[PDB]
């Protein structure tokens, strides 16, 4: 009872940091896999998804 | 009749009336720009004349 809002997110236990994933924001996200060229710095997180 | 151009005939004359700026030109307010930069070079159209 109280509970606020139940979510159906992808399990972190699976998908481990072990992986690379990081699941804390909500989506998938693993750094330095695909990145686009020509970029300034910071532009290529959208790609971590 | 008019009057005949002093550079028309070969007399020295020396009064003239002279037009002058009232005060200094270079008032020294330089016009300075907000350049922005192309986000990604990939993505740049050098296409089209």
């Known amino acids: ?49 | 009749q008019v009057g005949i151009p002093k550079l028309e005939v070969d007399h020295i004359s020396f009064s003239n009336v002279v037009s002058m700026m009232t005060a200094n030109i270079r008032t020294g307010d330089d016009m300075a720009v907000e350049r922005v930069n192309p986000d990604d070079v990939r993505a740049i159209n050098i296409r089209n004349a």
């Open chain 1, 1 to 49: 009872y109280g509970a606020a809002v139940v979510n159906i997110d992808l399990n972190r236990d699976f998908f481990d940091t072990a992986t690379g994933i990081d699941l804390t924001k909500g989506i998938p996200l693993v750094q330095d896999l695909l990145v686009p060229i020509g970029v300034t710095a910071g532009a290529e997180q959208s790609a971590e998804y």
